[PDB]
């Protein structure tokens, strides 16, 4: 199958050329909303933690797949293990607000506490990369405060991605990347 | 990704017609920079076709003719085009159209294949693909850029966070 490469129009040749037969595909596991819905760990800070999806490590499955889209939208679910009373604050609210029990506050109930949070940012859709290294302060879901927070998790809901970006793998030194695979 | 860290392979004049040769895996060093091998690291298994795109960059007065071939596992891959001619292969040459597209079949015993390459695997399980230069008119020092993208039936499943 020959064509003009400079066209950039996608050209997918198939096995039927030399006499194969194309099989059936089931792509559920690569679906954006499916693959990004799960918890990913973020190293917390003792008291105040601004909820931000860019704090996830870049090499994690949720971190990497997030960063491959310039423009992303989703709700948020958090799972927190903390002491005291976990207080949440909406986007753009003053830091002095986190000390008010009137704001949403989850009294400590062991082992941990799970919340579901709406998309609170003013911008129609958020961004992983911004041209203006820093990202604007308006990108965040708000912050949470507690006497101390031991663990923090993010789970995206209804994820939507736009304008894909490079996704890199580990570069082997030898001809292949050889890892020890689970075996009995 | 090729030697010298350039995304192309240059025509060569010598008894050696092997232009580039590499494992078929999504953990290969050559694939490492692609977007396709970018998603792979977050999934354990895949199936389906992986397409390769070739675009000849040389001047209008230079002509070459190439061979791409698939060497299935179980035997050493071919070192000469005459040896490879028995495999599944395609052959094309330069002309008005600058680009060629070749679909590498998914051919395996099990319906799915691991993305990662196990350390106890000495020889690739999915075999090799080999790119040869049949001949070239006046093509010395002319570049062939190559690209890779998913096919129609390419399917990828079982997400996992491997670090990386």
């Amino acid at each position, epitope marked *: 199958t020959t064509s003009t490469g400079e066209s950039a129009d996608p050209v997918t040749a198939t096995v039927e050329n030399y006499g194969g037969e194309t099989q059936v595909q089931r792509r559920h596991h690569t679906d954006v909303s499916f693959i990004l819905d799960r918890f990913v760990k973020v190293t917390p800070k003792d008291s105040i933690n601004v909820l931000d999806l860019m704090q996830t490590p870049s090499h994690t499955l949720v971190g990497a797949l997030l960063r491959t889209a310039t423009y992303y939208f989703a709700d948020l679910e958090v799972a927190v293990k903390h002491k005291g009373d976990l207080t949440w604050v909406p986007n753009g609210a003053p830091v002095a607000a986190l000390d008010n029990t009137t704001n949403p506050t989850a009294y400590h109930k062991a082992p941990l506490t799970r919340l579901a949070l709406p998309y609170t940012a003013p911008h129609r859709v958020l961004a992983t990369v911004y041209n203006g290294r820093p990202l604007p302060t308006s990108f965040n879901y708000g912050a949470i405060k507690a006497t101390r927070v031991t663990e923090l998790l993010y789970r995206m809901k209804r994820a939507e991605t736009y304008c894909p970006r490079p996704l890199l793998a580990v570069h082997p030194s*030898a*001809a*292949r990347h050889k890892q020890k695979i689970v075996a009995p | 990704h*090729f030697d010298g860290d350039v995304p192309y392979v240059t025509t060569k004049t*010598d008894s*050696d017609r092997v232009l580039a*040769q590499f*494992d078929l895996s999504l953990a290969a060093k*050559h694939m490492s920079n692609t977007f396709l091998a970018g998603l792979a690291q977050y999934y354990t298994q895949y199936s389906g076709t992986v397409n390769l795109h070739f675009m000849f960059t040389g001047p209008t007065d230079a002509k070459a003719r190439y061979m791409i071939a698939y060497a299935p596992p179980g035997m*050493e891959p071919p070192k000469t085009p005459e040896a490879a001619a028995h495999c599944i292969h395609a052959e094309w040459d330069t002309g008005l159209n600058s680009k060629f597209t070749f679909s590498i079949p998914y051919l395996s015993a099990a319906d799915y294949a691991y993305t990662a390459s196990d350390a106890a695997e000495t020889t690739n399980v999915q075999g090799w693909v080999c790119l040869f230069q049949i001949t070239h008119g006046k093509a010395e020092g002319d570049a062939l850029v190559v690209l890779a993208s998913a096919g129609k039936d390419f399917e990828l499943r079982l997400p996992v966070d491997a670090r990386q």
Partner: nanobody
Amino acid sequence: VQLQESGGGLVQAGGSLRLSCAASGRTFSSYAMGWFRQAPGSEREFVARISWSGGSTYYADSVKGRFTISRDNAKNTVYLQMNSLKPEDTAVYYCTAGFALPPSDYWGQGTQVTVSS
């Protein structure tokens, strides 16, 4: 299929060594051959390559021009001639076989080389 390095030892700066690697178990003239080096405490880095035909080679930049790789298909062996040795070059040198542009798989045990100054 097993490889065995040899020719290592000790030397002082400006010296030279010739490493030797023997292959066994299958056709040696069908494989590309290359060397890796792991300096202690650094991760292991690439060195040099030789195609089965002996025609084509490639050299790591730091070793470019100082070292010369050569294989003997008759003798079922490959050689790395190290020249103008430098205290940085201290490392274990692994002999590698393989198909791919980098030779990769089928590693020997590697030999020890320490250049002193």
